[PDB]
């Protein structure tokens with residue numbers, strides 16, 4: 001399959017890769033995609049665990065580049081399940097004939113820039129060697145699964161799973177003793193599903209994460225049909241926001257309100273369900289005292305959800321500000337702890353010492369299990385790039401240049417590595433926004449930039465070192481006026497032993513970040529040198 005030479009090579013056929021392929025084709029450029037999976041979808045291809053589902057409403061979490069897709073697709077529920085989102089992606093891939101520009105089952109292993117010819121040379125684990133003028137890394141944010149770091153993993157005699165690499169056949173847990181290690185979004189979704197089959201489920205929790213009710217519901221096909229009438233308009237309202245959704249931006253400070261107004265307001269959000277409570281007051285993510293008032297409200301709801309008070313109290317998040325680890329949407333997760341066959345193992349109080357052939361040993365006891373499910377997250381934001389031998393000008397490795405944390409101009413490019421773009425990764429809003437908004441804007445800005453280079457007969461595009469250092473300082477400085485750096489999250493690299501602890505995302509909001517990108521492009525790509 002892959003061509004020997006191409007204007008642009010794209011790595012990844014998730015949402016980012018697919019749109020890049022599509023837009024570059026519309027721009028008359030030759031383009032080709034390489035993708036490790038057997039088919040399209042990215043995260044929605046790999047994460048097939050039971051209960052997988054989006055936590056941005058279906059009507060917002062979708063593409064907007066095609067009116068036809070917008071008119072014809074029918075979402076069915078407030079939050080789409082993984083199988084549904086996979087169906088939407090295959091729909092889009094079919095409509096635009098995308099598979100013809102993609103090599104599947106192939107991992108990019110190395111890429112090196114050649115200064116003499118201004119081109120990337122890209123190698124794959126099949127021994128393919130492709131020459132591209134431009135290299136676009138659409139390889140994802142949460143795409144390399146992280147195992148936890150525990151001795152004895154290869155000794156466990158039962159069945160071992162990671163939610164990011166879930167089998168393609170359903171997994172039958174009927175009558176088994178099952179462990180789940182991890183209580184982020186993945187563990188919160190997969191656990192209630194396993195609880196329904198397992199003889200016994202042990203949920204091994206380290207830090208409790210904050211979760212609020214999803215309140216999933218059927219979508220009214222009326223509502224849908226009206227939405228369709230003004231769908232493009234509705235999406236531009238989402239693009240003019242900090243978060244890339246219709247979330248209300250609460251104008252008040254959580255400190256200014258009385259306790260009663262605070263409870264009556266938070267009750268409304270709690271009842272309506274969904275993540276919008278994050279923007280209920282302007283300073284929840286800027287001030288510890290404001291944050292703590294909302295945090296206490298959430299924590300009280302949790303204590304009131306679980307009958308046994310001792311168990312309830314082990315579920316209550318402590319030690320970090322609400323919203324600074326990704327807020328989770330839960331569906332009958334806290335309720336699940338009321339069931340007889342469901343056990344919370346608090347591993348802050350009894351740390352896991354080892355996995356054994358039988359199960360898990362903590363400092364207090366051994367748990368015998370037939371299956372162990374790892375909901376332990378991902379090597380975020382940089383994990384997928386670091387799996388590739390990427391070499392830039394003067395043979396600098398990206399893995400070395402970014403060894404103290406990612407260094408980029410606008411998150412889009414890094415100096416010393418010309419003709420290379422990252423889609424929706426570090427240095428940009430990325431997962432701080434609805435990713436379909438983040439992704440569409442980067443794919444357009446990059447592919448426009450490329451078209452602009454061909455139009456003008458230029459062949460080399462590079463971020464100016466001083467602009468990149470200035471950008472990094474800026475990212476760091478605005479993060480430091482929020483509570484985000486205060487907490488060990490995958491946003492700061494806490495997912496991975498030994499990884500540098502640096503908050504990796506642009507927090508100033510999608511809207512502002514887009515303003516800045518447009519202004520840069522409008523000045524002919526200021527902070528880039530084009531030759």
Ligand SMILES: Cc1cc2nc3c(=O)[nH]c(=O)nc-3n(C[C@H](O)[C@H](O)[C@H](O)COP(=O)(O)OP(=O)(O)OC[C@H]3O[C@@H](n4cnc5c(N)ncnc54)[C@H](O)[C@@H]3O)c2cc1C
Nearest residue numbers: 012014015016035036042043054055056107108139140435
């Ligand atoms: C389970 C899950 C649920 C999510 N829910 C939401 C949500 O509700 N809202 C939201 O905004 N975001 C969500 N996200 C974030 C998600 O990352 C984005 O929404 C979006 O799906 C990412 O798209 P992408 O194409 O950029 O990357 P991906 O979907 O991850 O696709 C990248 C692809 O690149 C491939 N690849 C990587 N390295 C190589 C290589 N070296 N060679 C070849 N191929 C390679 C991978 O196999 C993968 O298929 C979720 C993430 C996860 C993991």
Ligand SMILES: CC(=O)c1ccc[n+]([C@@H]2O[C@H](COP(=O)([O-])OP(=O)([O-])OC[C@H]3O[C@@H](n4cnc5c(N)ncnc54)[C@H](OP(=O)([O-])[O-])[C@@H]3O)[C@@H](O)[C@H]2O)c1
Nearest residue numbers: 053054055148149182183184185186206207326375376377
């Ligand atoms: C709904 C929806 O859209 C959806 C669904 C799924 C994913 N997503 C998106 O992807 C992101 C990642 O979510 P996730 O759940 O896969 O990963 P996580 O958030 O990194 O939680 C990892 C968990 O494993 C625990 N843990 C880690 N190491 C450990 C160890 N050594 N020992 C024991 N435990 C270990 C870790 O414990 P602690 O103390 O917090 O480090 C934590 O409990 C999400 O944020 C969304 O962006 C969205």
